[PDB]
Amino acid sequence: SGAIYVGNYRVVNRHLATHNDWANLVWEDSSRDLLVSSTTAQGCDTIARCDCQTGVYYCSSRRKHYPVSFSKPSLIFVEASEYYPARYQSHLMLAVGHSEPGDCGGILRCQHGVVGIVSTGGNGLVGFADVRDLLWLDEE
Ligand SMILES: COc1ccccc1NC(N)=S
Ligand SMILES: COc1ccccc1NC(N)=S
Ligand SMILES: COc1ccccc1NC(N)=S
Numbered sequence: 001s002g003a004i005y006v007g008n009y010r011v012v013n014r015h016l017a018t019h020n021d022w023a024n025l026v027w028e029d030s031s032r033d034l035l036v037s038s039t040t041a042q043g044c045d046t047i048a049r050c051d052c053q054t055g056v057y058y059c060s061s062r063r064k065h066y067p068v069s070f071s072k073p074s075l076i077f078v079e080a081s082e083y084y085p086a087r088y089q090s091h092l093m094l095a096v097g098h099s100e101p102g103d104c105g106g107i108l109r110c111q112h113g114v115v116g117i118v119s120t121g122g123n124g125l126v127g128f129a130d131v132r133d134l135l136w137l138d139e140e
C-alpha cells in the first residue's frame with residue numbers, strides 16, 4: 001500500500017483505490033494503474049519535474065529503502081497479475097529490485113521530489129508508475 005498527497009489530490013494504484021477514492025474521483029487510467037481522488041486537507045509531497053533515472057524507493061516487504069537506477073517511462077508488456085491481464089502497462093519505469101503486491105504504493109523519489117509509486121514486480125524487477133508528466137497535480 002501507499003499514496004502520494006499533493007495539494008488536494010491523493011494518488012494511489014488504481015487496483016488499491018477505495019470506495020471513497022472512486023466516490024471522489026479526479027482521474028483514473030487502467031493502462032497506467034493510477035487513480036487520483038480529491039482530498040479535504042493538503043498533502044506533504046512535492047512531485048518531481050525532471051528526467052532523472054536514479055532515485056530511492058520504499059520496499060514494504062523488506063522494510064527498506066533501496067537506491068536504484070530506472071528506465072524512462074515506457075509502454076512495458078507486463079505479464080498478468082491478480083488485478084490486470086497481460087498487456088502494455090503505460091508510463092512504467094523498471095529497475096532491478098525486489099517487489100511484492102503489498103509493496104504497490106511505495107514511493108520512488110529523486111532530488112526533485114516524488115517520481116512515482118511501485119506498481120509491478122517479479123523476476124527481480126520492480127516497476128514504478130510515473131507521475132512526473134501529471135503537471136496538473138501541481139495546481140487547482
Ligand atoms: C531522493 O529524494 C530527495 C533528495 C533530495 C531532496 C529531496 C528529495 N525528494 C523528496 N524528499 S520526495
Ligand atoms: C508490485 O506488485 C506486483 C508484484 C509482482 C507481480 C505483480 C504485481 N502487481 C500487483 N498489482 S500485485
Ligand atoms: C519473491 O517475491 C515475490 C512473491 C510473489 C510475487 C512476486 C514476488 N517478487 C519478486 N519476485 S521481485
Ligand SMILES: [Zn+2]
Nearest residue numbers: 050052110112
Ligand atoms: Zn529528479
